[PDB]
Scaffold this active site. Structure first.
Site, mmCIF file in Angstrom:
data_model
loop_
_atom_site.group_PDB
_atom_site.id
_atom_site.type_symbol
_atom_site.label_atom_id
_atom_site.label_comp_id
_atom_site.label_asym_id
_atom_site.label_seq_id
_atom_site.Cartn_x
_atom_site.Cartn_y
_atom_site.Cartn_z
ATOM 1 N N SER A 197 86.993 -23.665 16.923
ATOM 2 C CA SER A 197 86.977 -23.297 18.346
ATOM 3 C C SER A 197 85.660 -23.800 18.934
ATOM 4 C CB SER A 197 87.238 -21.802 18.488
ATOM 5 O OG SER A 197 87.782 -21.498 19.760
ATOM 6 N N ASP A 223 98.144 -26.170 20.606
ATOM 7 C CA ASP A 223 96.918 -25.408 20.812
ATOM 8 C C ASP A 223 96.475 -25.475 22.269
ATOM 9 O OD1 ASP A 223 94.757 -23.839 20.308
ATOM 10 O OD2 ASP A 223 93.710 -25.261 19.004
ATOM 11 N N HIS A 241 96.464 -21.526 17.853
ATOM 12 C CA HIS A 241 95.042 -21.725 17.591
ATOM 13 C C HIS A 241 94.645 -21.227 16.206
ATOM 14 C CE1 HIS A 241 90.921 -22.559 18.507
ATOM 15 N NE2 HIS A 241 90.553 -21.292 18.418
#
Ligand SMILES: Nc1ncnc2c1ncn2[C@@H]1O[C@H](COP(=O)(O)OP(=O)(O)O)[C@@H](O)[C@H]1O[C@@H]1O[C@H](COP(=O)(O)O)[C@@H](O)[C@H]1O
Lengths: 600, 424, 626
Positions: free
Chosen positions: A122, A186, A319
Site C-alpha cells: 500500500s 485493486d 487489496h
C-alpha cells in the site's frame, strides 16, 4: 524487451519480499543469504488520509516539487524543470533520512557486499520507490558504479510522481529496477487519480475499511459514502484516461487545450514495470507507461448485470489478495507480454471480449492498447532516421569546419576574428556549413521537446560527445554572427537574451554526464563575455567600474586553459582579446593571473 | 632579363609544338587580356581558321589545357565532363606571362604585313606606328583593336585582304564602324564586346552590307538597332551570340522574313537579357535553327506558340526564366530533339500533356523546378530517355516512369552556392 | 494508412461526459428555467468553490421569446439575419467585424440580438460582467437563450483581448446546451481566424427539432414552434402559442426538416455560391452529438452538418411512437444522467477491415444512429472525409526546420549583395535601378526563392498542417523578422520599379503582402507578451516600410512643387513635415542602417528637395502657422 522475463534469482527475491510484507517510520531490516546475501528494508503502510496521504495545502492533488539536494537527477535535462511528487510521501521519506537510522543501515549492507532491496505494501511500497531512487543517486554521483542496482518490489502501491518524474527514471535506465505488482481489481493504485485534498472524507472512509487494525463490523454493510466514492473514482479515472488517450492517438483538437483549465486532471503517472496478476498461472508484464494507465480504467468497467455497491466490495477486498504471490512465485509462471499479444492480434478478427492473456478487455480497450503500441514503434522509427542520414551529415559538416579552423591557425590568426570580418570565400563557405548544422540540430531538439524520441536518447555517450564537439567548434562562430550584425543593440546580450536552445541543450547533456554543477561549463561562450566587456568599456564606463568583471573573466580563462577546454586561438598574438588586453592599464597588467599565457 | 631567362624558356616550349597548336596559342594570345572567353566562340574561330571542324580541335584544346598553358574555368554545378552541355559552360583564361610571350612572338614578325596585329594598350587614339605603315596594308588574319570613344573622323585607310576575324574591344556609349571594315572579302567572325557600363549603340549599318562570308558574331552590351525593310542577306551567318544585349523592342517592330536575312542560322543564344517581354514569332520561321539557348531572362513570360515549325531543333536550353510559366504545346511536335533544359524554372506550373510524342529525347534537366510537382502520363511512353537530372522531389514522380523504361537513370542534384557572381 | 489511423471522437465525447461540467451547466439551466421571469439574469452563484469551480452563469431567454411572440411570427420576420459591422452595435464585436467583403458580414439572428440588447439594458448585467472579470466563466443556457448566452460569451471574449494586452486572456467556455444556428459561414470563418473556436461547445439531442429546424429556408421556418418550445420551459398569448402545437403534423414536419437537411448536407461538396437558395445558417464551433448510448464530438462544420442529418434521419424502430419536440428538447437532463452510466458499462460484443473502421462504428453507435438502417452507410464515408491524412504537425515543423536551414544561404547571399552597395548608393536604390545586372539577377532569384518558401510555409499554416503554437515560437518569429527586415526593401523597390503605385494603389494600404503583415503581427505579439543609445548604425533598418514612406514623400514633394491650391498644399506640407520629423527622430536614434545615410541614397535627395521647398516663402509661411 528480454529484460521483462524474471530470472530465477529475481523470483526468489520477490518471494522473500512478499513474506516480509504480509507476515503470517519504523523501518525493519531483514538479512537473507538466499539466493545471494541480501538486506531487505521494509516500510510500514499508512492508514491516515491526512497527513499520511494528503497534507494540508491548497493544491487539489497534494503535489510538491522534489528536493534538488536529495534527488539532483530527477529533472528535465533539456529545460531544467524540476520533477514533482506527492507532498506527504516526500515529507515522510525526508523524516526517515534525517531522523531514522536508515542511512546507517543501508551503508552497512553495502560494506557487507549485499545487494539491497526495498519492499512495502500500500503506501509503504510508495516510500520504497523513493528509497530505491535515493540509493541510485548516491551511487551514480560517486565513483562506486560497480554497486548492484536496488530491487524495488511493491504490492499495490499508489501512483506517485509526474510526467517529468517518469521521464527522468527512464532516461537513466532505472525503470527495470522497480517492480510493481498490482491486482487488476485493486482500488488503492487508482486512488491518487481522484483529487485527494478536495475529497478527504471518502478517502478516510475507505482507508478505515482497509485498515486491519480499524474494526469494520457495520451490520448494514459498506457506508453509502464509500459507494458514492467508488462511482466518482471510476468517472475520474475515465477523464484522465481519455485525456491521455488523445495524446498518443492523434486527436489534436483546439478544444482540448481549453478543457484542461476547466477539468481537474491528476498529474500522477505510472512509473516502473507493472505486473498485473491476471491469473495464478499468468503474469502480464507491461513496460509502456501509457498502456498501464489505460489498463487502470478498462479493467474496472462494470459487468452487464452488477451494482456499483457489489463492484466496490470486490475492489476493496482485492487489496488484501497479494498473499498467494509468494506461493505462486516458487513455481514457473508464464510471463506473457500484453502489448505484444494485443498488437499481434489481427484487426477485426477476434475483436470481441476475448481472454487476451486472461483479462477480458473491451473493444475500446483493444483500440487504446493498439494505439499505445504503435506510438512506441513510431518513436523508435524516428530515432533510426536521426541516427542514419542526419548523423552522417553532421560529421561531414564538422570536418569541413575543422579544416577552416586549421587554415586560419596557420596564418597566426583566429578563426573567430576571420569569421567576424567575412572577407574571403572561406568565411562564406563556413557560414553555409554553420547554417546546415543549425537546421539538423534544431530538428533533434524540437522532436525531444514533444517526446517524439526514446527517453534514453539524451543519455547515449555517442550523441553527448558529438554535441560537445559541435558546441566547442561552432558556438564562437555563432557568437561572431550575433555581434557582426549588431544584434546586441536591439535585443540584448548574447548570454542574457539571445542564445540558441540547441547549445543550451548540449551543455546540459555534458554537465549531467560528468555529474558537475549545472551552468558551470561555459567555455564555449568565452568570446560572448569578452565582447560585452569591450562594448561596455567603449560606452562611457571606465576600467575601474568594470574591473570586477575583468578579473572574473581572467580567472575563468586560466581555469579553462588548465583543463584544455579553452580554445587555442585566443592567445595567437593577433586576436582581439590579446590586443585589447595590452591596452589595459599597466597596474592590472602587471599583476594578473594570465600575465604568462599572453604571447608577450 | 626575364625575356631570355624565363620568357624564352616558354617560347622554346611553345616552339616544340608545331603548326596548329602554336597558331591556336597565338590566337588565344590575340584575345582580350584578362577576359572570360566562352568555349563556343573559341571553338568556332578555331574551326574557321585551322579548318578543325572535327573533334581534333577539342582534343588540341584538352592537350593545351593539360600542360598548364590555359586555365579551363569550369562551373561547379556541372555533372558533365566533356558533353554537349559542358561544351557551352566552360571558359578559357590565359596567364599574363604567356600572353606577353605571345605578344613577343607576334612582334618578331614585321610591323606591317604581319600575321597577327595586336595592340595591348588602352590608348584612346589608334596606334601611331600602324598609321605610319598605313601605306602598305597588312594581310594579318587576326587584328586586335582596343580603343575608347571613337567616331567616324577617328579612322584612317586600312585594308586586310587575307583577314578572317577581327576583335574590337571598346568602352563608350556610341560607336562608328571603321571604314576599313569594308576591306576583308573573307571575314568570317566579328567580336563587338563592349566594356561600357552604359548601353552602346552602333553606326555605319551599310558596312554590314559590305560584309560577306561572315559566319560568326558575338555581341555584348550592344543595343541592337531596328532591322529595316532592306534584306541584307547574311547567308553565310550560322552562329549569333547575344550576351547582356538590350534589344529595346527593336526586333519587335521589324517585320522581315527571317528565312532570307539569316537563312543558315543554326545556333542562337540570348543571355542575361534584362528587358524582353516575348520573343517574336518570326524566329519560328527559320528551319535551319537547331539550338536555342535563352539564359537568365527574367522577363520572358511566354515562349512563341508556334515553336514546332522549326522541325530541326535538337537542343533546347531555356533556364533561369522565372517569368515563364507554361510551355507551348507545339514543342511536343518537335522531332529530333535530344536535350531539353528547363532548369531553374521556379514558376513552371506543369509540362505539356503530349510529351510522349517527343521521341529520340535523351536528357532532361528540370533542376530547381519547385512549382512543378506533376508529370504527364505520356512521359511513360518515352522509350528513348537515358539520363534525367532533377531534384529529389521529382524522383518520386519519375519512379513510375523508370519502371517502364529500363535504361532511364535519375540523378539527384543539390543546389550549390558560390561567390563568383561578385568576381566579375 | 487506415490501419495506422484511429478514431478519436468517441474518446473526446467520453471525456466531456465524465466531467460534471455538463451536469452543472444543466443544473444552472434548470435553476434559470425555474423562475427566471425577472429582468435580471440567472443567479451566478459560483458553487461555493470560488477557486475550485469557475463562475457558472446561465442565460434564459424566455422573456425575449415572449416579446417575439407578442408581435407574431410572420415568417422569417424574427429570423431575418442582421449584420454587425453596419447595423446593430459594432462596438461590442469590433474585433469580430473590424475588417469586413465576401458573402455578407458575419451576421446574427435577429431574436438573439434583441435578447442580447435587452440583457445589455439591465445595469445588473454590466455589474456582473465587472465582477467576473479576471476569472474563468462558464456560460450556459437552454434553447435560444443558450444561443443568447453564446453571444454574451462572445462579447466577453470580444473585450478580453482589450484587457489581455500582456498576459493571456483568462479561459471562458460557453456550452449553450443546445441552440439553433446563430451565424452564417462568415461568422464561423471570423471565429476560426481569431483562434477562438475552442471556447464554444454544443450539445444536441438525437431527435431534437430546434437545433436543426433552422436548416430549412427562412420563408418556411416555423417561428411558432421554436418560440413555443422556448415558452414551454417557463412554469405553467400563451394559449394561442400552445394552440399552434396541436395544429401541426409531427410526421409531416419531420419529413420537411429531414428533406431540407438532406438537401443542405450535400451542397457543401458541390459548392455553388452562385445559387444560395438555402438558408445561410451554418453551425460553428464543436458539436457534441449526444444519445442514450453515449456521445461523439465533431469539429468540422461540414462533418457536423452531415452527422446531424444522419442522426436525425436515422429513426428508431417503428414500435416507438413519434417523438414529440417538447420531450426531445426537455429530456436533456435524463441523457446527462444516463450517458456516463452507459459509458461505465462493459458491454460484451455479440470482419472489420481495420481499427479505423472499428472506431468509426463505435462512434456511430455512441452517436445514436441505427446500424441496421442504410443511413449509416454514407455517414461512415462522411466520417472518413473529416479526418485529415498526412504526417503529424510536429514532424512537419521538424522538416521545416531543416528546410529553412537549407534555404538560409540565399538570405546570406542577399546580405552579401546588400553589403556590396552600402557605401555609395544603397542596396535599395541599386535594386530599383538594376545596377550591375549580373548580380541583380542573382538577387532577384534569391528573393523569389525566399518568397516562395515563406508562402509555402504560410499555406501549410493555413491548412492546419502545423502545430497551433507555431506563431508563438521564438525561432520562427525571429527568422521571419530577419527575412522581412532584409528583403522587404527589395520588394518595395520591385513594386515601385513597375510603377504599380500609380495603378494598384499605395503599397502600405493595398500593395503590402499578407506575409509581411503576419510577420509584423507576430513580432508585435512577441514583444508584448514578453534603452541605451545605439553607439553605431544598426545593421538593418528597424522599420521595414521606411522606403515606401520615402517614395510617397518624394511624390508628395514633387506634387507640391507644382501645386497651386493653398488648401491642398497646406495638408500635403503638413504630411511632409510629419514625415520629416519622424525621419529625423529615427536618424537621431541611429535606428536606420548606414545605406540610408548614403550620399546618393534616395533619402538624402528627398531631404535636399524638402529643404529647397522649405526655402520657398509660401512654404515657410505655411509651416510657420503649423
Ligand atoms: N535578434 C535576433 N534576430 C534573429 N534571430 C535571433 C535573434 N536573437 C536570437 N536569434 C536566434 O533565434 C533563435 C532562438 O530560438 P531558439 O533556438 O531558442 O528556439 P525557441 O526559443 O523558439 O524554443 C536562436 O537560434 C538565435 O540564434 C542566435 O542569433 C543569430 C541569428 O543568426 P542566423 O539567422 O544566421 O542563425 C545566430 O547567429 C545565434 O547567435
Amino acid at each position: 524487451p528480454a529484460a521483462a522475463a524474471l530470472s530465477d534469482d529475481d523470483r526468489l527475491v520477490v518471494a522473500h519480499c512478499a513474506a516480509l510484507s504480509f507476515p503470517p517510520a519504523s523501518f525493519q531490516v531483514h538479512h537473507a543469504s538466499h539466493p545471494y546475501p541480501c538486506a531487505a528494508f521494509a516500510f510500514p503502510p499508512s492508514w491516515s488520509a491526512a497527513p499520511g496521504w494528503a497534507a494540508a495545502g491548497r493544491a487539489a492533488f497534494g503535489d510538491a516539487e522534489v528536493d534538488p539536494s536529495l534527488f539532483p537527477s530527477l529533472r528535465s535535462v533539456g529545460s531544467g524543470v524540476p520533477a514533482r511528487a506527492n507532498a506527504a510521501f516526500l515529507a515522510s521519506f525526508g523524516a526517515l533520512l534525517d531522523g531514522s537510522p536508515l542511512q546507517s543501515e543501508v551503508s552497512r549492507a553495502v560494506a557487507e557486499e549485499k545487494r539491497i532491496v526495498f519492499t512495502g505494501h500500500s503506501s509503504g511500497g510508495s516510500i520504497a520507490t523513493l528509497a530505491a531512487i535515493w540509493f541510485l543517486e548516491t551511487c551514480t554521483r560517486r565513483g562506486s558504479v560497480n554497486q548492484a542496482h536496488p530491487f524495488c518490489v511493491t504490492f499495490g502501491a499508489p501512483l506517485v510522481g509526474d510526467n517529468t518524474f517518469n521521464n527522468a527514471v527512464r532516461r537513466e535506465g532505472w525503470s527495470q529496477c522497480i517492480l510493481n505488482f498490482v491486482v487488476p481489481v485493486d482500488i488503492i493504485p487508482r486512488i491518487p487519480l481522484t483529487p485527494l485534498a478536495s475529497a478527504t472524507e471518502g478517502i478516510q472512509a475507505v482507508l478505515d475499511w482497509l485498515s486491519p487494525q480499524t474494526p469494520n463490523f457495520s451490520p448494514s454493510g459498506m457506508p453509502l459514502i464509500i459507494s458514492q466514492f467508488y462511482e466518482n473514482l471510476l468517472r475520474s479515472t475515465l477523464s484522465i484516461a481519455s485525456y491521455e488517450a488523445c495524446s498518443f492517438m492523434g486527436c489534436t483538437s483546439s478544444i482540448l487545450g481549453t478543457l484542461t483549465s476547466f477539468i481537474e486532471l491528476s498529474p500522477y503517472r505510472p512509473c516502473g514495470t507493472y505486473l498485473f496478476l491476471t491469473s495464478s498461472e499468468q503474469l502480464a508484464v507491461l513496460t509502456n507507461s501509457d498502456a498501464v494507465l489505460q489498463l487502470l480504467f478498462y479493467c474496472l468497467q462494470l459487468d452487464p448485470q452488477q451494482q456499483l455497491r457489489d463492484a466496490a466490495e470486490r475492489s476493496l477486498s482485492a487489496h488484501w489478495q497479494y498473499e498467494p504471490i509468494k506461493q505462486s512465485m516458487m513455481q514457473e509462471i508464464v510471463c506473457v507480454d500484453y502489448l505484444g499479444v494485443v498488437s499481434s492480434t489481427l484487426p477485426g478478427r477476434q475483436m470481441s471480449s476475448t481472454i487476451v492473456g486472461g483479462l477480458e478487455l473491451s473493444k475500446e480497450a483493444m483500440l487504446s492498447l493498439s494505439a499505445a503500441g504503435q506510438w512506441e514503434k513510431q518513436r523508435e522509427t524516428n530515432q533510426a532516421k536521426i541516427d542514419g542520414a542526419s548523423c552522417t551529415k553532421i560529421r561531414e559538416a564538422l570536418k569541413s569546419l575543422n579544416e577552416y579552423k586549421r587554415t586560419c591557425e596557420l596564418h597566426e590568426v583566429s578563426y573567430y576574428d576571420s569569421f567576424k570580418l567575412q572577407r574571403e570565400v572561406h568565411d562564406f563557405n563556413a557560414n553555409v556549413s554553420r547554417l546546415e548544422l543549425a537546421g539538423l540540430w534544431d530538428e533533434i531538439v524540437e522532436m525531444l521537446r514533444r517526446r517524439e524520441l526514446p527517453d534514453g536518447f539524451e543519455s547515449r555517450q555517442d550523441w553527448v560527445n558529438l554535441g560537445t564537439l559541435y558546441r566547442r567548434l561552432v558556438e564562437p562562430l555563432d557568437i561572431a554572427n550575433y555581434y557582426r550584425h549588431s544584434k546586441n543593440e536591439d535585443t540584448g546580450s548574447y548570454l542574457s537574451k539571445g542564445r540558441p536552445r540547441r547549445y543550451k541543450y548540449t551543455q546540459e547533456w555534458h554537465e549531467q554526464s560528468q555529474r558537475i554543477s549545472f551552468g558551470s561549463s561555459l567555455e564555449s561562450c568565452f568570446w560572448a563575455m569578452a565582447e560585452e566587456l569591450q562594448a561596455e568599456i567603449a560606452n562611457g564606463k571606465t576600467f575601474e567600474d568594470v574591473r570586477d568583471r575583468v578579473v572574473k573573466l581572467e580567472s575563468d580563462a586560466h581555469g579553462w586553459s588548465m583543463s584544455g577546454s579553452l580554445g587555442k586561438d585566443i592567445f595567437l598574438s593577433r586576436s582581439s582579446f590579446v590586443i585589447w588586453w595590452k591596452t589595459l592599464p599597466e597596474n592590472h597588467r602587471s599583476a594578473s593571473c594570465i600575465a604568462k599565457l599572453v604571447p608577450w | 632579363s626575364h625575356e631570355t631567362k624565363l620568357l624564352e624558356r616558354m617560347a622554346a616550349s611553345i616552339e616544340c609544338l608545331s603548326g596548329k597548336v602554336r597558331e591556336c596559342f597565338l590566337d588565344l594570345g590575340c584575345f582580350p587580356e584578362d577576359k572570360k572567353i566562352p568555349l563556343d566562340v573559341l571553338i568556332n574561330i578555331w574551326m574557321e581558321i585551322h579548318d578543325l571542324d572535327e573533334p581534333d580541335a577539342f582534343a588540341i584544346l584538352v592537350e593545351l589545357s593539360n600542360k598548364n598553358l590555359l586555365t579551363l574555368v569550369n562551373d561547379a554545378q556541372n555533372k558533365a565532363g566533356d558533353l554537349y552541355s559542358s561544351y557551352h559552360d566552360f571558359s578559357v583564361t590565359q596567364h599574363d606571362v604567356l600572353r606577353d610571350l605571345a605578344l613577343h612572338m607576334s612582334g618578331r614578325d614585321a610591323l606591317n604585313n604581319r600575321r597577327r596585329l595586336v595592340m595591348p594598350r588602352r590608348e584612346e587614339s589608334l596606334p601611331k606606328d600602324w598609321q605610319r605603315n598605313k601605306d602598305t596594308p597588312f594581310e594579318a588574319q587576326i587584328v586586335s583593336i582596343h580603343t575608347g570613344e571613337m567616331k567616324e573622323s577617328d579612322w584612317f585607310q586600312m585594308s586586310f585582304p587575307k583577314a578572317e576575324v577581327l576583335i574590337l574591344n571598346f568602352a563608350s556609349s556610341v560607336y562608328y564602324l571603321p571604314p576599313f571594315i569594308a576591306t576583308m572579302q573573307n571575314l568570317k567572325a566579328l567580336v563587338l564586346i563592349n566594356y561600357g557600363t552604359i548601353s552602346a549603340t552602333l553606326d555605319n549599318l551599310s558596312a554590314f552590307t559590305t560584309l560577306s562570308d561572315l559566319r560568326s558574331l558575338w555581341l555584348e552590351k550592344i543595343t541592337l538597332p531596328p532591322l529595316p525593310k532592306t534584306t541584307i542577306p547574311l547567308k553565310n551567318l550560322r552562329k549569333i551570340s547575344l550576351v547582356l544585349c538590350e534589344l529595346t523592342n527593336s526586333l519587335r517592330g521589324s517585320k522581315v522574313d527571317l528565312s532570307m536575312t539569316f537563312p543558315r542560322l543554326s545556333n542562337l543564344t540570348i543571355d542575361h537579357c534584362i528587358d524582353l517581354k516575348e520573343l517574336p514569332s518570326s524566329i519560328c520561321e527559320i528551319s535551319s535553327l537547331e539550338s536555342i539557348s535563352i539564359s537568365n531572362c527574367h522577363d520572358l513570360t511566354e515562349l512563341p506558340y508556334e515553336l514546332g515549325k522549326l522541325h530541326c531543333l535538337s537542343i533546347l536550353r531555356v533556364y533561369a526564366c522565372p517569368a515563364l510559366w507554361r510551355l507551348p504545346p507545339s514543342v511536343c511536335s518537335l522531332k529530333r530533339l535530344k536535350y531539353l533544359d528547363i532548369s531553374q524554372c521556379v514558376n513552371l506550373t506543369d509540362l505539356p500533356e503530349e510529351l510522349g510524342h517527343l521521341t529520340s529525347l535523351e536528357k532532361i534537366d528540370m533542376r530547381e523546378c519547385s512549382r512543378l510537382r506533376s508529370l504527364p502520363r505520356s512521359s511513360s511512353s518515352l522509350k528513348s530517355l537515358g539520363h534525367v537530372v532533377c531534384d529529389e522531389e521529382t524522383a518520386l514522380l519519375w519512379r513510375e516512369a523508370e519502371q517502364v523504361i529500363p535504361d532511364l537513370r535519375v540523378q539527384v542534384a543539390e543546389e550549390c552556392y558560390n561567390l563568383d557572381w561578385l568576381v566579375d | 494508412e487506415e490501419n495506422s489511423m484511429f478514431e478519436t471522437s468517441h474518446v473526446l465525447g467520453a471525456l466531456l461526459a465524465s466531467s460534471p461540467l455538463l451536469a452543472r451547466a444543466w443544473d444552472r439551466c434548470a435553476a434559470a428555467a425555474d423562475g427566471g421571469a425577472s429582468s435580471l439574469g440567472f443567479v451566478h452563484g459560483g458553487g461555493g468553490g470560488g477557486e475550485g469551480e469557475p463562475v457558472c452563469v446561465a442565460f434564459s431567454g424566455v422573456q425575449a421569446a415572449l416579446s417575439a411572440a407578442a408581435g407574431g411570427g410572420g415568417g422569417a420576420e424574427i429570423f431575418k439575419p442582421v449584420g454587425l459591422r453596419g447595423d446593430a452595435a459594432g462596438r461590442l464585436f469590433a474585433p469580430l467585424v473590424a475588417a469586413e467583403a465576401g458573402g455578407e458580414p458575419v451576421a446574427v439572428q435577429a431574436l438573439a440580438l434583441q435578447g442580447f440588447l435587452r440583457l445589455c439594458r439591465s445595469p445588473e448585467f454590466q455589474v456582473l460582467l465587472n465582477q467576473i472579470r479576471g476569472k474563468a466563466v462558464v456560460f450556459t443556457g437552454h434553447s435560444l437563450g443558450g444561443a443568447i448566452a453564446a453571444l454574451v460569451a462572445l462579447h466577453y471574449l470580444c473585450t478580453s483581448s482589450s484587457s489581455s494586452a500582456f498576459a493571456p486572456a483568462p479561459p471562458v467556455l460557453c456550452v449553450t446546451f443546445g441552440s439553433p444556428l446563430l451565424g452564417n459561414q462568415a461568422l464561423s470563418r471570423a471565429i476560426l481566424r481569431e483562434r477562438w473556436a475552442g471556447n464554444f461547445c454544443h450539445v444536441v439531442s438525437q431527435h431534437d427539432v430546434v437545433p436543426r429546424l433552422l436548416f430549412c429556408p427562412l420563408n418556411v421556418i416555423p417561428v411558432h414552434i421554436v418560440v413555443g418550445m422556448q415558452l414551454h420551459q417557463l412554469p405553467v398569448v400563451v394559449a394561442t402559442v400552445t394552440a399552434r402545437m396541436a395544429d401541426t403534423n409531427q410526421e409531416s414536419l419531420r419529413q420537411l426538416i429531414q428533406e431540407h437537411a438532406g438537401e443542405a448536407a450535400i451542397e457543401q461538396k458541390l459548392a455553388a455560391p452562385e445559387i444560395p437558395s438555402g438558408s445561410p445558417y451554418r453551425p460553428f464551433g464543436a458539436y457534441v452529438l449526444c444519445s442514450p448510448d453515449g456521445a461523439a464530438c465533431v469539429d468540422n462544420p461540414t462533418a457536423a452538418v452531415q452527422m446531424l442529418y444522419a442522426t436525425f434521419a436515422a429513426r428508431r424502430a417503428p414500435e416507438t411512437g413519434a417523438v414529440p419536440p417538447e420531450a426531445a428538447h426537455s429530456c436533456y437532463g435524463d441523457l446527462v444522467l444516463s450517458m456516463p452510466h452507459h459509458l461505465l458499462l462493459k458491454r460484451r460484443l455479440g470482419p472489420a477491415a481495420s481499427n479505423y473502421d472499428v472506431g468509426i462504428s463505435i462512434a456511430l453507435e455512441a452517436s445514436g444512429i441505427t446500424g441496421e438502417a442504410t443511413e449509416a452507410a454514407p455517414a461512415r464515408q462522411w466520417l472518413k472525409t473529416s479526418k485529415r491524412v498526412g504526417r503529424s504537425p510536429s514532424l512537419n515543423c521538424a522538416s521545416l526546420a531543416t528546410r529553412l536551414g537549407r534555404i538560409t544561404p540565399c538570405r546570406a547571399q542577399i546580405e552579401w549583395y546588400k553589403a556590396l552597395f552600402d557605401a555609395n548608393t544603397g542596396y535599395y536604390d541599386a535594386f530599383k535601378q538594376r545596377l550591375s545586372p549580373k548580380k541583380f539577377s542573382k538577387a532577384n532569384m534569391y528573393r523569389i526563392k525566399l518568397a516562395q518558401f515563406w508562402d509555402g510555409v504560410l499555406s501549410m499554416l493555413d491548412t492546419s498542417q502545423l502545430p497551433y503554437d507555431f506563431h508563438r515560437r521564438a525561432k520562427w518569429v525571429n527568422a521571419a523578422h530577419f527575412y522581412q527586415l532584409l528583403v522587404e526593401p527589395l520588394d518595395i523597390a520591385d513594386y515601385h520599379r513597375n510603377n504599380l503605385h500609380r495603378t494598384r494603389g499605395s503599397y502600405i494600404t493595398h500593395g503590402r503582402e499578407r506575409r509581411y503583415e503576419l510577420f509584423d503581427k507576430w513580432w508585435k505579439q512577441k514583444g508584448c507578451t514578453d534603452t541605451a543609445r545605439r553607439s553605431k548604425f544598426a545593421g538593418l533598418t528597424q522599420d521595414p516600410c521606411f522606403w515606401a514612406r520615402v517614395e510617397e514623400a518624394r511624390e508628395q514633394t514633387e506634387s507640391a512643387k507644382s501645386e497651386r491650391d493653398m488648401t491642398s498644399l497646406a495638408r500635403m506640407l503638413e504630411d511632409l513635415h510629419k514625415f520629416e520629423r519622424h525621419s529625423s527622430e529615427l536618424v537621431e536614434n541611429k535606428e536606420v542602417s548606414i545605406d540610408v545615410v548614403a550620399p546618393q541614397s534616395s533619402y538624402s535627395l528627398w531631404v535636399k528637395e524638402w529643404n529647397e521647398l522649405k526655402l520657398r516663402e509660401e512654404v515657410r509661411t505655411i509651416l510657420f502657422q503649423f
